[PDB]
Design a protein around this ligand. Structure first.
Ligand SMILES: [Mg+2]
Ligand SMILES: [Mg+2]
Lengths: 195, 109, 191, 348, 139
RNA sequence: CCAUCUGUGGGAUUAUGACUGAACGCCUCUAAGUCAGAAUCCCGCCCAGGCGGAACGAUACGGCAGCGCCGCGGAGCCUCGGUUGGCCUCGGAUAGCCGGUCCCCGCCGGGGGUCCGGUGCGGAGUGCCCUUCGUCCUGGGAAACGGGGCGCGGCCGGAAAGGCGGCCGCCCCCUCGCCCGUCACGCACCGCACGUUCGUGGGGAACCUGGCGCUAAACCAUUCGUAGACGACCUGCUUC
RNA sequence: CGUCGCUUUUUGAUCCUUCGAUGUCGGCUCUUCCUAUCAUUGUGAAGCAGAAUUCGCCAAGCGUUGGAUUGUUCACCCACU
RNA sequence: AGAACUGGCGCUGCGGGAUGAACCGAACGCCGGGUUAAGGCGCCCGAUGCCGACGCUCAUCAGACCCCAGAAAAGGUGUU
């Protein structure tokens, strides 16, 4: 149906290249919490080449021309857009299957979220080399919604403690509930053939 | 009752970079992502099933809006679990990204 | 080159006990407690043995700019051990020509309000890093004392006084006026 | 190449779309942000500029050469009938900006408000808010109306207030109330919201909102000047007399290789009727108008401490193209955006 | 934190490659990423395997620094590495993982029926532990 | 400017000067980690508001007509796509996970000792349904909650885009909603495709068909002149 | 004394495009861009006491005029800055 | 600007060089299956989604593939 990729710990182009391949193959991919996407190289280097992007402005009127987006949901969405054939109708239809959300909205906060170990910083960056966060390089360029997102992030996660608190309570029960067995005739085939 | 076929999406046609060849398709059969494990699917009949607004069946008692384009799996394509299939028409290019239907029929297992 | 490991040790005396949460270091001692995270530096820390209290920092394979930082770890830990038993005391003195520099302490040993620097009417309020203490010295002219546990907060505080007192648009080889650091010692002496 | 003599740009590109505004009443683009340690208060207020006079005041500026002398200064006067609070709007912040949470309007809304909800009041059956007024009295809609202040109090972080002008008290021939939506920037969201439920369908005077010598910002729409050319819209130097086909034109409107007319060049179009916010307009006097009929009518405006006459700020002959001021007024040092008889939002 | 090292005598498991799934005993490290290994009792002889292939276990052997095949063999079966590898929970997981892959179609029926059978018993009994816990807190 | 009025602050930082500090047993602004930092940069203020989204109001009688809302079956028209769902900790990576006695936070949460596991088995290489052909006869094991609901009545949780969910009381009802076994049956269509779902989907047009309710407003025309090339825009038009 | 580059705001060398035609000097008017920085902001160095200057650095945000002669670009002079 | 030798373009499509007269492969009747050359194989874009091997390198202007489309002398207790 729809796959949900949590975006923290991921590199920008390593994640957006895989997402752009899946979206051409018919799937519907939703990249969620794209404030914490990383990008390799230190912060000042990634900050300079984004400011070099901002002055890519057409001279005669900048209203027509390059639309420099500032939220990191649209920083990511534009990176996917350059890895899709978007001037064709095959790639117009591709970018409609991608819905990228900054933060985690309530249709997608109670789903289970997936990661891509191809694009993780821990996997792919050597640990002694520097990386920049997509959140605060969005903050330094005109994205004015960092504080009101990170307030809603810690409101989301405190409610996400109280669910996981009572979910590990329930599996402490059904593992104490299976202490009193009375069913070992059914353990016989599973232990013999991988429980 | 249940699904007697394996899921596969239609990726495109056999192509270089500029020109493409329409007579052979290539498929991403699901769950196989290597060239060593694709040997099961060779020779399998596969189908693209779709809808129209006129009516046709072969046994089905009354013609419905469902119709099909048959074909079969020819060989493997690259190291990464892809598969090329030769149909009997060409795929309409409307089907890029949509699924096809890979059966189990000409089986040696 | 990718060498087989190096290792510095740090002996700890009895009045201070290092516990480690991970690469974080927790140093409790006589005159307080202070902590640093070293979660950016990619090394294993190991305190070994009761009753002797030796810390063993060692880095597996590593290269020459990664081998440079194993000595950097243990010399931040040795300043956390010195600063929690002895403390840090950076005495500093005011150097002045014609104009006496008038330095007062406004908020409880935290803010320093410097006026009459070289005849200027603009006061200079320098707010310090939390953990240091201001003091006009005794039995000595024009001396200021800073006391604290952490060397990077005292010495940064000692630099904000000296940097605010900067002579501008002048020959700075004459006009040698400013409040410069003069001694690097401890709160408790001789331990 | 290289003009041989540098000039600066003619006109500012900060006001580029020299367009008719999409509004007649000035929109507040930004209310002042609050710290909730303050007492609870409104921030803006609607007014009507009536005309201008001038003043004599003993100026006090130590250091200056004007000090302890009398100066004349041009003032405008802005007639302010009191606002009547009608609605309460909540706003919850999203990562897509502020979003309206919900609105609750007054029990019985006035007639000058309901005229604003119609482009043809004469062809109307005046059926607006007939089903909505009943839920204040019907108990089933009322016990959820009290829920939708408790949902308001829990979730939305800034609340505002819908008020309007009492257009019966003006000499204007309009009678539609100007319905504004202004922010209460006081304390916490409980105190901010029970200060607005307390005062639905009640009046708010201007001295409860503003004060004497409390410098504010004036927002309005300018004097519309019509479709004028380059030499009036942008103040470009006229061409010399010998010019064929026209004097009052901008001569070179670009180079060859950008091969397109740039946005930063001057050309003809609509001058005036633009939305502007003036800044730092000091209030000189909050006059109040025409009290009770026992002391048959105290006119008594414009009556300074040194005058002691029975004067009133409506001048001898009435304000030109406005009418005659009978309500409270604000007088402001300096020029103010607008024509006479024009709505303008005074704002902190 | 780094509780198992490479060492002369460290028993490594082999994950992939031409010897995937058989133990080796590390004999000598040669250079930085290649180790000389062998398993004499587990059918893999003396050669140089990469460290990225091998999986370190917690078994050590006291044989000399790069001895012959005999002396490694005597250290292997005195300490009884092949039977102590049977009584570990990590070889029970590779045993269980290959029992599930050779699980036939008829056994996949017999697994299915007894799997839904024991989940009825737990779900009706974990309901009874819910049914008692609310009865603790109602007084 | 030939009269008068107004012109607005924050951030990360450059240059640079430093702090701690190794490499190189000293030293060192740098290598890891920090500090100050500007007519620059970016935002705020200000100007416009997207084939960008909200909240709310009123929602067509008259003389027949007419329109929403719920409960309905009955057909044909078009667009086609899918063939079971996972109902969620934060995160670390030279480290983490589970269970836990004690002393602190309005009968729940913070810490540490201890016991666990760990190429993760309290493992989305996984998990619960399930590969359910149905029914009858007929015995065991398991289970004393019944499970679907057009039910009726209740509460209270989820505002970041809540349109979702949970608990409870009465109820026509089931006592076959599981596993093993005994028994015999239903399209056994005579080897063969698009079968099997989501789905009594999405959009539209009409009718026989139950109740609940509803009775407006835009544009022109006229007027105004805070507005105007023309459109647009701002207004008025009550039998006082 | 050498010697290594850069730039295409000079002049040439070239003759690829244009001969069924690309309106050809200068001034006026107006816009935007570059830095190889005159001034202004922050700095570093002097054979920097102050004052005045010079040499560098981040730096193109913002400014860089009024005239007499000359068709002049250029030049030169007066005056302000 | 002007010669020598050979091949090309002009008269010539096609695969690769993003793009292209002349470069690198290769020359062409209309098709089906197989294989390759030059060139490639993150995603546009067919093919490394190999548990590829070994090192070198951090740039506040990194680097990145014949012709071919940007740099020298000099210098660095930057690392090897
Ligand atoms: Mg705004
Ligand atoms: Mg050749």
């Amino acid at each position: 149906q729809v796959l949900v990729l949590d975006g923290r710990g991921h590199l920008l182009g390593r994640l957006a290249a895989i997402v752009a391949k899946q979206v051409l193959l018919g799937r519907k991919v939703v990249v969620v919490r794209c404030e914490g996407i990383n990008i390799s190289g230190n912060f000042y280097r990634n900050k300079l080449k984004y400011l070099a992007f901002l002055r890519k402005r057409m001279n005669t009127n900048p209203s027509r021309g390059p639309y420099h987006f500032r939220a990191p949901s649209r920083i990511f969405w534009r990176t996917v857009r350059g890895m899709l054939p978007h001037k064709t109708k095959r790639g117009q239809a591709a970018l409609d299957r991608l819905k990228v959300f900054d933060g985690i909205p309530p249709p997608y906060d109670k789903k289970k979220r997936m990661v891509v170990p191809a694009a993780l910083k821990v996997v792919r960056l050597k640990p002694t080399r520097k990386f920049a966060y997509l959140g605060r390089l969005a903050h330094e360029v005109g994205w004015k919604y960092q504080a009101v997102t990170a307030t809603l992030e810690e409101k989301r996660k405190e409610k996400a403690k109280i669910h996981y608190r009572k979910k590990k309570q329930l599996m402490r029960l059904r593992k104490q509930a299976e202490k009193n067995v009375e069913k070992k005739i059914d353990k016989y085939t599973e232990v013999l053939k991988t429980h | 009752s249940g699904r007697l076929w394996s899921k596969a999406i239609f990726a495109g046609y056999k192509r270089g970079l500029r020109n493409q060849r329409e007579h052979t398709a290539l498929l991403k059969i699901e769950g196989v992502y290597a060239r060593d494990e694709t040997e099961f699917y060779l020779g399998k009949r596969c189908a693209y099933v779709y809808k129209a607004k006129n009516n046709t069946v072969t046994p089905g008692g009354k013609p419905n809006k469902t119709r099909v384009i048959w074909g079969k799996v020819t060989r493997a394509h690259g190291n990464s679990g892809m598969v090329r299939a030769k149909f009997r028409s060409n795929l309409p290019a409307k089907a890029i990204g949509h699924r096809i239907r890979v059966m189990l029929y000409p089986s040696r297992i | 080159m990718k060498t087989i490991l190096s290792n510095q040790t740090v002996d700890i005396p009895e009045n201070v006990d290092i516990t480690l949460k991970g690469r974080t270091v927790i140093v409790k001692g006589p005159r307080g407690t202070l902590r640093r995270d070293f979660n950016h530096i990619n090394v294993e820390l190991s305190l070994l043995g009761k009753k002797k209290k030796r810390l063993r920092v060692d880095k597996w394979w590593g290269n020459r700019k990664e081998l440079a930082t194993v000595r950097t770890i243990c010399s931040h830990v040795q300043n956390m051990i010195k600063g929690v038993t002895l403390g840090f005391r950076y005495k500093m003195r005011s150097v002045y020509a014609h104009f006496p520099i008038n330095v007062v302490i406004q908020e409880n040993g935290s803010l320093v309000e410097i006026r009459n620097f070289l005849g200027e009417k603009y006061i200079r309020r320098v707010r310090m890093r939390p953990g240091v203490a201001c003091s006009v010295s005794q039995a000595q002219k024009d001396e200021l004392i800073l006391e604290g546990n952490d060397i990077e907060l005292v010495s940064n505080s000692a630099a904000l006084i000296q940097q605010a007192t900067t002579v501008k648009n002048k020959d700075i080889r004459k006009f040698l006026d400013g409040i410069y650091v003069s001694e690097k010692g401890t709160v408790q002496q001789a331990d | 190449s290289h003009r041989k003599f540098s000039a600066p740009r003619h006109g500012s590109l900060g006001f580029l779309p020299r367009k008719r505004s999409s509004r007649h009443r000035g929109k507040v683009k930004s209310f002042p942000k609050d710290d909730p340690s303050k007492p609870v208060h409104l921030t803006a207020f609607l007014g009507y500029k009536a005309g201008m006079t001038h003043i004599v005041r003993e100026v006090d500026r130590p250091g200056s050469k004007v000090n302890k002398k009398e100066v004349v200064e041009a003032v405008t006067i802005v007639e302010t009938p009191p606002m009547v609070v009608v609605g309460i709007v909540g706003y919850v912040e999203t990562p897509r900006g502020l979003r309206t949470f919900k609105t609750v309007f007054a029990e019985h809304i006035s007639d000058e408000c309901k005229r604003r909800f119609y482009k043809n009041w004469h062809k109307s059956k005046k059926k607006a808010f007939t089903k909505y007024c009943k839920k204040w009295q019907d108990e089933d809609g009322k016990k959820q109306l009290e829920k939708d202040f408790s949902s308001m109090k829990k979730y939305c972080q800034v609340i505002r207030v819908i008020a309007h002008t009492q257009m019966r008290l003006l000499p204007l021939r309009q009678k539609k109330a100007h319905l504004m939506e202004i922010q209460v920037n006081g304390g916490t969201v409980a105190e901010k919201l029970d200060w607005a439920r307390e005062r639905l369908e009640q009046q708010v005077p201007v001295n409860q909102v503003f004060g004497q010598d409390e410098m504010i910002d004036v927002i309005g729409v300018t004097k519309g000047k019509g479709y004028k050319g380059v030499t009036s819209r942008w103040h470009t130097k006229k061409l010399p007399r010998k010019t064929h086909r026209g004097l009052r034109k901008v001569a070179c409107i670009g180079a060859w290789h950008p091969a397109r007319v740039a946005f930063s060049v001057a050309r003809a179009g609509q001058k005036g009727y633009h939305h502007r916010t003036e800044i730092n307009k000091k209030i000189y006097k909050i006059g109040q108008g025409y009290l009770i009929k026992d002391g048959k009518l105290i006119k008594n405006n414009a009556s300074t401490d040194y005058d002691l006459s029975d004067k009133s700020i409506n001048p001898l002959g009435g304000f030109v193209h406005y009418g005659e001021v009978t309500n409270d007024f604000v007088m402001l040092k300096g020029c103010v955006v607008g024509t006479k008889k024009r709505v303008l939002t005074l704002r902190k | 934190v780094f509780r198992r090292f490479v060492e002369v005598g460290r028993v490594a498991y082999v994950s992939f490659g031409p010897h995937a799934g058989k133990l080796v005993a590390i004999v000598d490290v040669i250079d930085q990423n290649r180790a000389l290994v062998d398993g004499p009792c587990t059918q893999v002889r003396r050669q140089a395997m990469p460290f990225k292939c091998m999986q370190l276990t917690d078994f050590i052997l006291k044989f000399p620094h790069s001895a012959h095949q005999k002396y490694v063999r005597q250290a292997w079966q005195k300490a009884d590495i092949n039977t102590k590898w049977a009584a570990t929970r990590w070889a029970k997981k590779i045993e269980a993982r290959e029992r599930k892959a050779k699980m036939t179609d008829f056994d996949r029926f017999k697994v299915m029926k007894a799997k839904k059978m024991r989940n009825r018993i737990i779900k009706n009994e974990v309901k009874k532990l819910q049914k008692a816990a609310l009865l603790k807190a109602s007084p």
